[PDB]
Amino acid sequence: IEVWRRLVEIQFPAEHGWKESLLGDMEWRLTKEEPLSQITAYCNSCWDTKGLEDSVAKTFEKCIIEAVSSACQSQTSILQGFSYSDLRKFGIVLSAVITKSWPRTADNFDDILKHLLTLADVKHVFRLCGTDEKILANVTEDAKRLIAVADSVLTKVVGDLLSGTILVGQLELIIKHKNQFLDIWQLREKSAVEEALDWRREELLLLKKEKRCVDSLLKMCGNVKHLIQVLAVRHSQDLSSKRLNDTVTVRLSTSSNSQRATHYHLSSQVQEMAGKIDLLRDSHIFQLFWREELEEVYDYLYQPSYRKFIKLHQDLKSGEVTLAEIDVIFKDFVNKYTDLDSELKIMCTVIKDRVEQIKEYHHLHQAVHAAKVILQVKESLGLNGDFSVLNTLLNFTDNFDDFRRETLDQINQELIQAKKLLQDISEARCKGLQALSLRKEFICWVREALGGINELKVFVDLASISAGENDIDVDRVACFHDAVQGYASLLFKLDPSVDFSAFMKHLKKLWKALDKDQYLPRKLCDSARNLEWLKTVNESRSSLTLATAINQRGIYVIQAPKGGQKISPDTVLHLILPESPGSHEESREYSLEEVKELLNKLMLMSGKNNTEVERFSEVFCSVQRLSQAFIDLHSAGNMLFRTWIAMAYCSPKQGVSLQMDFGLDLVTELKEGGDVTELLAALCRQMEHFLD
């Protein structure tokens, strides 16, 4: 600093920029350091015993103020554990802090309050000011005015709180920042509110609870709005800026405990109804019971549903509930034991595996379904063993109406064992067996044609030949293949006279077949859908094969249109596909449209290494470019290419890849080998240059 002062103070003419440049260099050397270190130096390092009037100190202070501005816009408090040896520099820093951290719209009570309750630098500056009064003398009058308006805000908030005239927003924020508010108040005061804050908090909680109960009341009726059509005005009022003593009757030091009539003035009857609907809004059972206008909702709608609910709860705790409306109610809790246990736990406002009955009951129903499916499969696979063990459960629905009046444990004893015989069968396995049973013709056709898994691959191969060259058509084989592989145990190697025990010991294989691929039933069903195409496969080209053949032998012919036809790529270009040596085919001729349709096919085909497609597209594009060059030359009046024909061989034929004939006497037939694409590109470049 001594050097910088000595150098900057040299009284050079100001029109030259000596002091400016020196101080710029010094500021650069400073700013490099972490702003915290800059401030610590400005505050503690002894460098200003020779007065701060020097431009050196001014520039240092400017840099420190910029640092403080940045660190305040960072909302990272600075005065935490800060040591100062100089009070003037520290006061400058504190004033910069109070000024920058202050909001840029610092006339709104709200922003100022949140700023003095959230930011921590405020706490530290208040604490320092309260501890030492000398630092205040070192504070700028702007920061002092800010501190004064802050203390005024605090005094107003405290007058409100202790008096009960505060806005819901301010009180909410204060409760959120109760500790910081209390601390700043104690600090400033050093230069009641607690009990007041607690009372106002209770008032706010009561108000919010009434609001929530009202919201539950409204949401309940909101369910039947599709069938049946002040409180909304009040409950809609924005409390954020309303006054507490207006909404809720605040308990001040004016009076002890007294009932708080909030903004609504609910009749205690409506109060209880709302509390009930609120503690019961999360009840699906009550949501259903709510389903059967102005008020009278109490006993026209709410009380009947609620008494039915209370009777249901008593029956639950008793076990006397009947099966009929059990089926009607708990139909939605199947495989939802957690939702059910919670819907019960909520009933202890005034058992855990008592409801297991319902759960077990559900399983029983499932078993019945399974049983039926089993019967179906017994008919589909044509079994013979005895399966009437489930006919009891088959006559369950032949006894449903007489069973419903039979209460839960009164249901029956026999099925309690049958349930455990099918307890292993999951719903997914029921669906698998269902897909198997629904299909009979497919099963017979499979047993007949294939006869065994060893005959599958062969079949699959044939299917791959007549699939159809596309995604679904090709996947039709992987489907029915994974199927015949998974359902093999039940299709080929099952004895037609295996009763329940052996039948389940056999389905032990389909268990794993399914757990390996959970989509096996879908494959079997989609195969049964494709029975016609499978029979077609049994009784007995592609775009990729055609493309390979074209690459091996195709000849693209570019010509001047014949018969005075208009000049266009369709007329100029056409492909020749010669028959292969010995093949009974002939030299087919393809137009441009056909070639590009084949291209689209190749692009959208199964593609399940796009080597041939890439070469095809490359040669096709090169030939199209050549045709366009020829057309452009023809349009420009060039008479040379009038009788010009070019044959591009997609593969070298007798060492010839490209051939040209102008149909003239002088120009002999030209031809060259090599790569067709590079040669065609060179030819196209030459023809374009010639066009120019």
Binding site: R29, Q73, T76, G222, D332, R522, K523, M603, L604
Partner: protein, 714 residues
Amino acid sequence: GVPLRKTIAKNLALKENVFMMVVCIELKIPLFLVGKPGSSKSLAKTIVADAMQGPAAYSDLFRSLKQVHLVSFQCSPHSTPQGIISTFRQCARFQQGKDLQQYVSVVVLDEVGLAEDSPKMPLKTLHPLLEDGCIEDDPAPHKKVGFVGISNWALDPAKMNRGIFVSRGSPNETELIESAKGICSSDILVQDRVQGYFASFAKAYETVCKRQDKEFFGLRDYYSLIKMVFAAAKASNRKPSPQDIAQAVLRNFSGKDDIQALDIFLANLPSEEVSPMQLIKQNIFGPQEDAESRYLLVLTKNYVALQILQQTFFEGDQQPEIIFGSGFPKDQEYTQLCRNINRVKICMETGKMVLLLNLQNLYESLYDALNQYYVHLGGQKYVDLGLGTHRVKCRVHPNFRLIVIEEKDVVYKHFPIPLINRLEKHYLDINTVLEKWQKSIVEELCAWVEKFINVKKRHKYSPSDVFIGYHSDACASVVLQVIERQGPRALTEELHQKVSEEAKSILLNCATPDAVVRLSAYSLGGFAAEWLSQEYFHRQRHNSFADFLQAHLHTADLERHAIFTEITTFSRLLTSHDCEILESEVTGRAPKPTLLWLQQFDTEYSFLKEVRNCLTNTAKCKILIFQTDFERSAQLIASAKYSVINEINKIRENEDRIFVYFITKLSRVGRGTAYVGFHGGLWQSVHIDDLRRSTLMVSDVTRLQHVTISQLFA
């Protein structure tokens, strides 16, 4: 009988449309359907097709009904009568030699209204075709085919052959609530948990539709919001939280500026915050289950979204495949569409994400692929892709996502409304990723730049004359690259300083030596000027491409096996001799660096073949150099960059390092368009004045600063 996804709204519209389609197909009645996007027209089409497969039907109801084969044709203002004629003839041919009482062909015309008042007047041919299927040729039974004309635009009944016309209107609040319930019909518990928000959502949707100027938002957004809330509540087994509703709303009702979609929707409610980054991540990497979300329509300015996505979301070998319009001189045709659709289908089959950047022309081919109306076979889903008249079902892997990047103006102006409504919209620019301190850093950098250029200085330079490729979003991209490289570390004073300095260095790396010398001079020395001169001439490497390559190879990210560098220079491009010198210099580390000239390739496939031949080698360090001479060269450069990235991704098989150097030759003055760089992302931008080794002046500049012209001859 027909199988349907649980999340599909079994609403009155879909039921009516399916009924009418079936009846009018079995009886061959021209059926015209009109309605706003999301009216369940195309969904009904797919359901009807997949349902009446004939003997292969899912139900006994449709097993006793005609088998249907659709021949779809998307009508556009540029359509011609020959399109409709060819479509009808194709359908007839399909009906040629069949039992018309057990098989029927249906011409499906999508967006008929687009061709209503077309100057070519294609619809004038429907009347005869709908009557007997023959314009002038003789009639016949196999020529009379069914007709379904689906449109989101109004139609003229006089061009319907007095067939059936069903115009559906914008549904009401109760219809919307009923649809929302139908969507949540899968689970009644979750349905009850979410039923409270249906009315609020419907009211907010109507309010948005009224407020918005153009029909940006639509029914699909509402349905997707309902599905999101339903899936959230289902996975949570609990009432939806405010943050869930907020996420859903901002995922489906974001992309426009006028509509906030949040203050409108809540209106009685509080949640806290969610950024478009998180929304895009949810769409791509969302938390068995048909919880599939729509495809993205990331809007942006100057295509910064591409670099943001490349650097932020995917940084490993999970990179997506970029579909782009080839900027090569001769690869501008329909074959490009064919190749791009092949790539889209291959990605669909394999499960590779896709990035469409300039492909709004590939929407007559992806129209049905974006609707997400799938048909299944053995647990695998298939959606219709198309090329011209060809249209076939392609498989879709579960891990397949599609991301469309386009400019906000291009979307708001030229994108068809249904294409917007078929996609999840979101605006992504740098400011949407940067925080406050980072924006302040950007401003500080702009100021430091304007100082760098001119100090105190007789001439007035522009930042593009000192920082090559500088543009509006340069320092922003720099700060973004910086913070992305640093990691998720939070704010800190030291971090602010470090970011500022690293950005300064990154900018300087694209500066000229003239500039730093000028700074050192006009500043009469100075700590800053000298620090920058040191950083430029001693820490960095700009004397030649060989020194830069050495430094890179010796200080390249080991984990990252692909490093992309964009170099710009004023001198002459490299040659076989320079490549041989480099080879002799990089012996043992890497083989001969392959060198390519973009202006020598007339097609993208030749470029790809060369890139593959260069990458097919077994070397552990492959150096590729793509040299171009700026002089429509930016399109070529970008196409080549995307091709190289895609090819490197396809060969992402080992830990072999792949260095890529795009070397663009420029003029210190310019002769036309201005070169734009700082593309950010995975692209280190650099400027090397001269790439050669300076045989004549073997001296590293900053050595002639301490030597006179006399001492050179001593």
